[PDB]
């Protein structure tokens, strides 16, 4: 049962001390270089972020002083022979005291102090990336020594020399000839020589620092060519740049069928763009124009992973390793806002273009169905349910109707939605269960796509209306001649056809097959891959065949019954298969090829 | 315009000055309590791990001298009305000096010192979890006031008081009435009061701390119920015990049909167990987008990023590994160099395990392949390395025409009895073996005498194309082999060219075939495997311009012989049967996609075919 020793017998009887928490660097450097960042090559990304922050600070200072704006760029150099990578910027610069304060202290960031000493939050607060003060020390996991050439931009400041080796001790000195800005020299480790190649650095910049506000040069060439098209006015940016941007973030070659540029910032300063791929069967998270994660399976729901684009926000909380704070107290609100906006955007797409949405729905229908089944809160399913499209029995085939518009013509007296899950419309329009509903003027929705039954059962409600399935409710031949025509038909097709009746709704089809077990009809369709032997499928399904006396084939069978008994049996077996093919019960007519070939040879014997 | 500002004009001018790296206490605490752990619920997990480490230290200390071992017990106490949670253990305990050295100094812990003091790294090195020294500070995320009582288990130690509000300043005093072990009092924040409920603590602990090496009690109630059966000898754990552990990780009420208890040490300290569910996987579940990572019996909750191969997502289990590196947030280092070796090693072991099961119980493996065979097909298609493709190919099972029905053969044994004179493997796709025997492709293939594989499941044909090679033998389908490799000439030639006149909009070239015996016609495609896949998933004039169907007829067949008199007796009916013959050959290829109009033309043809009877 319960056995606990919890008690409050402890008492305070000593003298209290007052001393600060101790904080050394021997273990902090080891943690940063061994157990801080999940992946190795993020160190030059952090260096580029620091350079961009310095350039932004210098630009703010220059525009505050109201003077000219000189050149400001980030230059990347990599010597393959020397095995070193050089990054140099022309930012504000750092003095002796500034170097000691920032570089020599763990987590002490001058960017945060600059932000606190800004007091406007509109000029350059959003462009400052550095917030933790540990970005620079990421270079110690790949370098045995780091050389920094930093000089402040003040009119009279002198350069300084900074040395370190990652062992918790740094030897700062004085340097001459250092130009304005900061120059960092990194000597790669023996095991980390892979960063000495230009291609790797180019890949890193394209992955992470491809949207830096300032020009970036690697060995003297500029390759950004992407000025953060999501940060400007959606009206200003054209549709031509959307295709090029989509092909980059999604790593695809097709075009986006839809373009949603969301910029309204209710919960957070969200600047996101969403694309829908054309290729029918993933969003890259950004923060202050710096990539966070390529996959980002948290900001968006799983069922919305089919879209592509980026989500950039300048106020989301980031982890120490510059990764998203998963499932934070505020991130969950972002997912609901993004899901609601995308759902609303999709609804507006259907109204403005029904045909385009129908093509879109038939391409990503499984994604919408996946969300409803996997959704937890009921009202969330209602918004996704509005995206579903179904064809009703009261409207001609080929046009899809939404669930919301289905209730528009629904009677006030009726309170439950009727849906039928069938492989195709031919079986649904002829099933006796639908005929029971067809007696009244009510309409029933038809579900054809796979997993529709699971989605409808999981949804269980729409617009305060209970979801209930129909299955859970429960010129012409003479009459005398047609009577014995079926009697012989049930002999040859006793195992397959349960019974044959009279049909007056066949314009040009000699027969149709109809089923009373649409639930088991999908079982018949699902057995087209495993164990579809002819001698077995008849018993598991047991369908009924309907024929019309107004067709030539049915009329012709009267004389062939007695004149050519051998041909009569084969022809009836052929016409029964044709009904299944027309009704869609068989995925492919491969089995009927064997008997059809042997039928035509004797059908033209006199010819 | 290549311009750069990189140069070497910089040079040293002055002399170096002695300096040492420093750290900001307030910023470090703020970062730890605000931007270190994604989940605010992991502070109790970190404190439980610390308590377990302390208990392990006490156990090692009291077995080193070989005296009586005291009881091991850990308490998780929560007060809803007070909004506080109490964590008490019976660990080694900390004196004032130990408290100021460990608690008062950021990132340094006695666990690393204890590990270095082992001098053996064989007794308690596998049970120590704390390695970063910042686990305790995770409590400040939800606590604005931390009260700690601790005292060492030394013979004559005294209790102490430890208070900290997370502001970087902590006060230490001497406390009376404290017993052996460390007791921690956490005062929850106003906005972080959700952790004051029993259910929250219970579900977080069951998420993170199921397999603690020592008993854990929530308000005096034991809540472990598991003993981490993946640690001891695999023969020690029984078959029934596997099911009990299966019901937790798999979150299902069924039983595992397979069990792979993997314990290797040469490439990595791996103690992993994998279960194969006995139930058929759900189609909806398969279309949606596995194993649980464990380190020192502590969950890493890194199920994402596919640590396990995607085609192996159908198995459930845990992968315990103590030598893997973790970041500060106690999470897996994503895209690490060492973690990629874990995926390759596990994949090879799982592939070998499935091969052994097939050789052990062939009948049982046949049912397993009929259920989870789609995963193997997907993996070969999605594989980026060629060598990986053949390894998964051993798990594929097919039946050939040589042996009777009911027995399945692997790709490896197929080449054993295959003739060594050709570097080709022949496979045929058909819904049934019976249909495969009577397929036109097999009939034309009967000229040669080689065994041919039969593919029945979906996407099986695409798997062979992606594999493209097995044991240095090419994979060529029957239809591919045909294209690459009585009626007189005068009567056949005029009919052969006449068909192209009416079938020009559908077919391109028609040739004579001497291999077909009981099939009027057949169609060959240069790349039929891609053609079938193109018209199946992604999907007449719009397709005939790219498909290029190379139809070919058999002069020996009666239908082709009958076309000679039919073309002359009534021109108006000959083209209808030719279209039907072309349609029949199209169906046998599997390239038919819209058979809605096929029945309409077929039924209409029979109207005037024999109406004079
Ligand atoms: N290239 C540079 N030019 C000027 N200052 C820099 C440069 N790189 C880093 N710094 C300074 O070093 C400090 C610490 O940066 P770092 O440790 O990389 O993390 P963070 O950028 O988050 O502060 C920052 O406050 C920044 O001002
Ligand atoms: N419940 C506890 N009992 C005894 N010692 C503890 C307890 N919790 C923490 N400690 C001590 O505090 C030190 C630092 O712990 P922590 O900051 O959690 O980092 P780590 O998890 O790496 O030990 C450890 O050396 C450990 O001895
Ligand atoms: F660049 Be630091 F990690 F904020
Ligand atoms: F548990 Be500590 F972060 F090593
Ligand atoms: K710093
Ligand atoms: K500590
Ligand atoms: Mg930074
Ligand atoms: Mg800890």
UniProtKB/Swiss-Prot annotation, chain A:
The keyword Mitochondrion applies. Belongs to the heat shock protein 90 family. It is found in: Mitochondrion; Mitochondrion inner membrane; Mitochondrion matrix. HAMAP family: HSP90. Found in skeletal muscle, liver, heart, brain, kidney, pancreas, lung, placenta and bladder. Expression is highly reduced in bladder cancer and renal cell carcinoma specimens compared to healthy tissues, but it is increased in other type of tumors. The modification Phosphoserine is found at residues 101, 125. SUPFAM superfamilies: ATPase domain of HSP90 chaperone/DNA topoisomerase II/histidine kinase, HSP90 C-terminal domain, Ribosomal protein S5 domain 2-like. This is Heat shock protein 75 kDa, mitochondrial. Keywords: Acetylation, ATP-binding, Chaperone, Membrane, Mitochondrion, Mitochondrion inner membrane, Nucleotide-binding, Phosphoprotein, Transit peptide. The modification N6-acetyllysine is found at residues 193, 255, 263, 344, 351, 386. The lineage of its organism: Eukaryota, Metazoa, Chordata, Craniata, Vertebrata.
């Amino acid at each position: 049962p319960l056995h606990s020793i919890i008690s409050s017998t402890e008492s305070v009887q000593g003298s209290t001390s007052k001393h600060e928490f101790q904080a050394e660097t021997k273990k902090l450097l080891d943690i940063v270089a061994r157990s801080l960042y999940s992946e190795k090559e993020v160190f030059i990304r952090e260096l580029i972020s620091n350079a961009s922050d310095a350039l932004e600070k210098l630009r703010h200072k220059l525009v505050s002083d109201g003077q000219a704006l000189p050149e400001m760029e980030i230059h990347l150099q990599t010597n393959a022979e020397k095995g070193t990578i050089t990054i140099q910027d022309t930012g504000i610069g750092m003095t002796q005291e500034e170097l000691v304060s920032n570089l020599g202290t763990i987590a002490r960031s001058g960017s945060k102090a600059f932000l606190d000493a800004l007091q406007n939050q509109a000029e350059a607060s959003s462009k400052i990336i550095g917030q933790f003060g540990v970005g620079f020390y990421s270079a110690f996991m790949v370098a045995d020594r780091v050389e920094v050439y930093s000089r402040s931009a003040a009119p009279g400041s002198l350069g300084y020399q900074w040395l370190s080796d990652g062992s918790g001790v740094f030897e700062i000195a004085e340097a001459s000839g250092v130009r304005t800005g900061t120059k960092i020299i990194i000597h790669l480790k023996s095991d980390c020589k892979e960063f000495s190649s230009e291609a790797r650095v180019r890949d890193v910049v394209t992955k992470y620092s491809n949207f830096v506000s300032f020009p970036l040069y690697l060995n003297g060439r500029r390759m950004n060519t992407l000025q953060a098209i999501w940060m400007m006015d959606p009206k200003d940016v054209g549709e031509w740049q959307h295709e090029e941007f989509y092909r980059y973030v999604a790593q695809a070659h097709d075009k986006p069928r839809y373009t949603l540029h969301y910029k309204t910032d209710a919960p957070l300063n969200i600047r996101s763009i969403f694309y829908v791929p054309d290729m029918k069967p993933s969003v890259a998270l950004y923060s202050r124009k710096v990539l966070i994660q390529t996959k980002a399976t948290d900001i968006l729901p799983k069922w919305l992973r089919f879209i592509r684009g980026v989500v950039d926000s300048e106020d989301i909380p980031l982890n120490l390793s510059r990764e998203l704070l998963q499932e934070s107290a505020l991130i969950r609100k972002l997912r609901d806002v993004l899901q609601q906006r995308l759902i609303k955007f999709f609804i507006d797409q259907s109204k403005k273009d029904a045909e385009k949405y129908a093509k879109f729905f038939e391409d990503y229908g499984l994604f919408m169905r996946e969300g409803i089944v996997t959704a937890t809160e009921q009202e969330v399913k209602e918004d996704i349910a509005k995206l579903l499209r179904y064809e009703s029995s009261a409207l001609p085939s080929g046009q899809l109707t939404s669930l919301s518009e289905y209730a528009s013509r629904m009677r006030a007296g009726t309170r439950n939605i009727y849906y039928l899950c069938a492989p195709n419309r031919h079986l649904a329009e002829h099933s006796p269960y639908y005929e029971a509903m067809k007696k009244k003027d009510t309409e029933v929705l038809f579900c054809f796509e796979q997993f529709d039954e699971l989605t409808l059962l999981h949804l269980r409600e729409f617009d305060k209306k209970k979801l209930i399935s129909v299955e859970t409710d429960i010129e012409c031949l003479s009459e005398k001649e047609t009577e014995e025509l079926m009697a012989w038909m049930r002999n040859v097709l006793g195992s397959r056809v349960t019974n044959v009746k009279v049909t007056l709704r066949l314009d040009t089809h000699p027969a149709m097959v109809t089923v009373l077990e649409m639930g088991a009809a999908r079982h018949f369709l699902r057995m087209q891959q495993l164990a579809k032997t002819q001698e077995e499928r008849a018993q598991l399904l047991q369908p009924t065949l309907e024929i019309n006396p107004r067709h030539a084939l049915i009329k012709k069978l009267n004389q062939l019954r007695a004149s050519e008994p051998g041909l009569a049996q084969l022809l009836v077996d052929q016409i029964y298969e044709n009904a299944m093919i027309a009704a869609g019960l068989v995925d492919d007519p491969r089995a009927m090829v064997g008997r059809l070939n042997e039928l035509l040879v004797k059908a033209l014997e006199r010819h």
